[PDB]
Amino acid sequence: ETLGEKWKKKLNQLSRKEFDLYKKSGITEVDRTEAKEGLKRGETTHHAVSRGSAKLQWFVERNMVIPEGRVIDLGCGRGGWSYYCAGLKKVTEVRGYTKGGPGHEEPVPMSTYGWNIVKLMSGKDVFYLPPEKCDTLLCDIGESSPSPTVEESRTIRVLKMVEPWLKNNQFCIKVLNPYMPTVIEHLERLQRKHGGMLVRNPLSRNSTHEMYWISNGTGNIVSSVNMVSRLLLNRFTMTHRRPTIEKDVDLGAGTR
């Protein structure tokens, strides 16, 4: 039994009250107040469509992934990662695919800086899409489950789906459950071939052990995974630490 599995058992034991306090303890989060009001009023410039823009920005501004050329955004949802990449100088095209419909997010049309290089398509189950040529491959897919074996299966499905899209390109791929032994085997095989490293984003909630496989970095996957499991186990032991509130992103306006 891994440290992550002991974390998962503990999380599953929490009451809704305890879980809601635990999930944001000591994390970082962007203040969405302005954007929510703006979006509610139908504004299409400046606002990010979700917390996803700031989440991807954290990696980009640290050069862990450097979006360039034709960017593919798998499971784009509302389009937060797609709209953020659109405004980056090295980016020439952004293609977003998402399933949408019941239980899933629909793309939100925006007029933020670089919207003209963006195409977001709904009714697209990425698990049935044939790979396309791209210079940057992004994927934020992975739905949480109280079962870590269901999450292990979901994580492996994502890792097997993204691999044909990887051809010496920049990438940022969520790994929903990175602590299950079989996932670790796949990540090690994938890192030997495609390089990169697993990184914990400070904007992630403590209710998920997700880590991102980014292309620009090296390191020991096992040690980075166990570091997160220890971090998350320590966060159950003290009273709620209010999250660090940061400014949300301004994605501007106009064509590129």
Side-chain angles (χ1 to χ4, degrees):
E1 190 185 33
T2 66
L3 277 165
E5 283 167 285
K6 290 158 195 291
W7 162 81
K8 189 63 158 183
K9 289 202 175 297
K10 285 189 166 275
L11 185 79
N12 285 334
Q13 286 167 22
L14 300 180
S15 62
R16 193 177 185 183
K17 191 191 161 174
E18 290 173 315
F19 176 89
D20 289 335
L21 276 155
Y22 175 70
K23 63 184 191 198
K24 300 193 195 188
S25 187
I27 79 169
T28 298
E29 79 165 11
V30 294
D31 188 355
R32 293 288 295 165
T33 304
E34 199 179 332
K36 278 179 191 177
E37 190 172 342
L39 293 164
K40 187 148 180 167
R41 294 186 47 66
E43 289 167 34
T44 54
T45 61
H46 303 290
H47 314 300
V49 297
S50 65
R51 291 177 180 286
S53 298
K55 194 180 206 180
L56 178 60
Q57 183 192 55
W58 188 90
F59 289 129
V60 173
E61 291 184 350
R62 278 155 197 78
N63 293 304
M64 292 168 176
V65 64
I66 313 163
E68 65 169 53
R70 191 176 191 252
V71 174
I72 297 291
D73 180 18
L74 302 174
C76 62
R78 288 169 56 106
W81 281 25
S82 282
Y83 288 133
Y84 170 67
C85 290
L88 307 175
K89 47 212 172 146
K90 298 217 273 171
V91 175
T92 64
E93 192 190 328
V94 179
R95 295 275 288 185
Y97 291 108
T98 207
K99 190 174 177 193
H104 297 271
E105 293 297 323
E106 291 297 343
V108 170
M110 295 297 282
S111 284
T112 41
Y113 184 61
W115 64 268
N116 58 300
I117 67 166
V118 186
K119 203 185 176 192
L120 306 171
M121 293 160 295
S122 196
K124 296 274 169 167
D125 183 347
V126 301
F127 294 110
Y128 302 112
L129 288 171
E132 297 170 32
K133 281 184 207 149
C134 64
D135 310 289
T136 302
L137 186 284
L138 306 173
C139 186
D140 201 29
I141 297 175
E143 218 75 342
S144 289
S145 168
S147 167
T149 59
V150 161
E151 293 186 333
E152 165 193 51
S153 168
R154 291 179 180 172
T155 303
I156 293 165
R157 282 214 82 196
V158 170
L159 297 174
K160 296 256 277 171
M161 181 274 293
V162 295
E163 175 155 40
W165 294 85
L166 309 175
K167 314 287 134 153
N168 288 38
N169 29 19
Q170 287 290 299
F171 59 78
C172 180
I173 295 158
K174 187 174 81 179
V175 181
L176 172 64
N177 185 315
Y179 56 90
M180 298 294 286
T182 311
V183 177
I184 290 280
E185 282 192 69
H186 280 278
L187 293 160
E188 292 175 324
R189 173 189 51 86
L190 287 161
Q191 187 190 40
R192 277 195 294 275
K193 215 277 160 116
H194 302 102
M197 180 51 189
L198 219 64
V199 181
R200 173 75 179 183
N201 191 305
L203 294 151
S204 293
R205 284 170 185 193
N206 299 327
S207 47
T208 176
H209 205 295
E210 72 191 9
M211 293 171 79
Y212 292 71
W213 178 26
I214 47 83
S215 51
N216 314 339
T218 63
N220 193 300
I221 296 169
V222 161
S223 72
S224 70
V225 171
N226 289 314
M227 188 163 313
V228 175
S229 308
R230 288 184 170 94
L231 185 86
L232 302 181
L233 284 156
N234 190 59
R235 293 183 171 178
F236 287 124
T237 79
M238 77 285 295
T239 301
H240 172 94
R241 267 42 178 182
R242 279 161 289 145
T244 305
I245 310 295
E246 302 292 353
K247 281 283 163 204
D248 191 13
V249 303
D250 183 340
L251 295 176
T255 65
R256 272 194 58 213

